Design a protein around this ligand. Sequence first.
Ligand SMILES: Nc1ncnc2c1ncn2[C@@H]1O[C@H](COP(=O)(O)OP(=O)(O)O)[C@@H](O)[C@H]1O
Ligand SMILES: Nc1ncnc2c1ncn2[C@@H]1O[C@H](COP(=O)(O)OP(=O)(O)O)[C@@H](O)[C@H]1O
Ligand SMILES: NC(=O)c1c(Nc2ccc(I)cc2F)cc(F)cc1OCC[C@@H](O)CO
Ligand SMILES: NC(=O)c1c(Nc2ccc(I)cc2F)cc(F)cc1OCC[C@@H](O)CO
Ligand SMILES: [Mg+2]
Ligand SMILES: [Mg+2]
Lengths: 291, 291
Amino acid sequence: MELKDDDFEKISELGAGNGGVVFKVSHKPSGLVMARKLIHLEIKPAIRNQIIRELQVLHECNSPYIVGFYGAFYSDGEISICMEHMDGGSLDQVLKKAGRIPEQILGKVSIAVIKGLTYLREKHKIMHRDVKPSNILVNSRGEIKLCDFGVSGQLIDSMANSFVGTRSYMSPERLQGTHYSVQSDIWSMGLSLVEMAVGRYPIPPPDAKELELMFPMAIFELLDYIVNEPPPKLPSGVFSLEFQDFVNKCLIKNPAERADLKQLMVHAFIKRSDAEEVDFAGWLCSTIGLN
Amino acid sequence: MELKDDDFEKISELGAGNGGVVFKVSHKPSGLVMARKLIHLEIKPAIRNQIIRELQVLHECNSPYIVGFYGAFYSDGEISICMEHMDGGSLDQVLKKAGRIPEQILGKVSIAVIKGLTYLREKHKIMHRDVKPSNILVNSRGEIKLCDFGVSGQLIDSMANSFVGTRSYMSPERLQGTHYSVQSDIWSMGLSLVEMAVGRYPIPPPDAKELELMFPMAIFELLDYIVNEPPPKLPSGVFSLEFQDFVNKCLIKNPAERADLKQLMVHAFIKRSDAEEVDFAGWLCSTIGLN
Ligand SMILES: Nc1ncnc2c1ncn2[C@@H]1O[C@H](COP(=O)(O)OP(=O)(O)O)[C@@H](O)[C@H]1O
Ligand SMILES: Nc1ncnc2c1ncn2[C@@H]1O[C@H](COP(=O)(O)OP(=O)(O)O)[C@@H](O)[C@H]1O
Ligand SMILES: NC(=O)c1c(Nc2ccc(I)cc2F)cc(F)cc1OCC[C@@H](O)CO
Ligand SMILES: NC(=O)c1c(Nc2ccc(I)cc2F)cc(F)cc1OCC[C@@H](O)CO
Ligand SMILES: [Mg+2]
Ligand SMILES: [Mg+2]
């Protein structure tokens, strides 16, 4: 059935980035609890139907690695995208309370992301455009899912400004021009993994004294680092050699040299992670206390 | 009297940046129309009183070049700052409908800004930290006023992320580290003036063919320009030699070499503008249609 503004009821606020706030809501007619993202866009009515219209392909975005879509509509200056509520939140949140995420777990995470990106590529011909820990969502059934991918050309445009937060996951080629594409998602994924593995955003990399503890930076400074200095890497010793190479292949500067989804899929790390018997569901609650 | 949440009534939305929306509101008990800025901040209660407390010095910020302050309070996840409603909007808005702002007018603008920055310096020991066309506000009485200056240390911190919009007014030294201070406001002012004088954000500068018509860029690309390439400048011929030097002295890269408020105050351009008989009030409406 169609989703309409007054059919919803606010339960709590799930958080905010810039551009959007997201609420936990009850769809009164179905009883379903969902997550409603609201984007305040001061834009003409012609284009705002094109956005709604371009968001409808999300109805055909069915994968266990992609957040579910319920519907999209316009009301009171804001676009509403209504999604499956992920009760585990985003990996940036679980990182905060975890402190650090084990290699084992990041194994299962890496698989979801690669498979998610692959689904979007093959079935829908789109790149993500914003892979970072807060666009990777988890739940109590142990699912790991992507959202906030760039389905709508016109939405991408109307929101065009981006991310100055003292931290950026954009690939060097994306930071330097328009000559970029899907390979860029691999860079972002690689950098997210190193962050989650290490406990902190990994630039500048931990100086010798700072990696001891294992039991800010200005805008131009940070960007210059990304584009001009050698990429981040896992510390040796405490992570497996296969994981180290895996992230190493993700964080190669030259996007044509960088590994692509085809190659990461059949990587030793993924093959080793896929076999492993990991109770993610159990670990997720043990750390964030959902039960 | 004290300002409280339920004493207000929404009239219209004056716009949004990121971090805040600002509404045109009626303070029901006084009848006063004011502008209410709302900042959504997910922050502990101890610090949020420090913010309110640090915003109270705005009660002593009385200058004809500074937006008036009515009060500040916390309600429902958001800090509210209530200001004098400037019915002319911001100079970024008047630029859009003006197309271009005359030299004469920018004369009167430059004076307000310098005098505003000077007031904040001498009487309050603060730098602005965000001089750009949308933090310069005008009204039907012909007033030109600054707001959104950094009065509250703790607010500055809690909002710490900034400006990625394909356009930045931060000085080179501010983009490259923490070694910056009040001189940085001069850079921002100089760049705002060149924008308003020219009709478009002035980086990259107009190539020979593009300055003919007088009757985008990636993040790192833009920043690298600011810090590493020679600064923007007025085109010759269509602006006075005194204005040209004035902006030239504002946009010097080295912050110790850059002109300071003391020097711009007694600059030929300012002395020439101060004498001039300009009906700003009249021009403002002639262009935006307020009457
Ligand atoms: N479908 C969802 N289910 C549960 N939580 C969500 C969902 N979508 C978003 N969130 C939460 O909302 C927060 C803010 O989302 P968003 O507006 O996209 O900002 P950002 O991703 O930049 O933090 C996310 O960090 C996440 O915690
Ligand atoms: N006191 C005010 N009176 C009238 N309009 C205002 C006032 N303060 C802000 N505005 C309007 O609100 C808009 C958005 O303000 P803000 O949240 O500071 O975002 P930004 O300054 O980044 O555009 C401004 O561009 C201006 O048009
Ligand atoms: N940011 C979004 O939420 C977003 C978006 N949202 C979105 C997509 C799928 C699902 I399931 C849930 C969602 F909410 C859909 C778009 F088509 C473009 C978007 O954002 C575009 C800007 C980014 O590229 C960089 O910030
Ligand atoms: N942005 C603000 O609105 C803001 C602020 N607001 C503010 C100040 C004076 C008046 I009269 C009206 C106002 F609304 C007061 C502060 F103390 C810090 C601020 O912002 C800090 C961030 C900026 O430095 C960079 O974005
Ligand atoms: Mg998100
Ligand atoms: Mg402002």
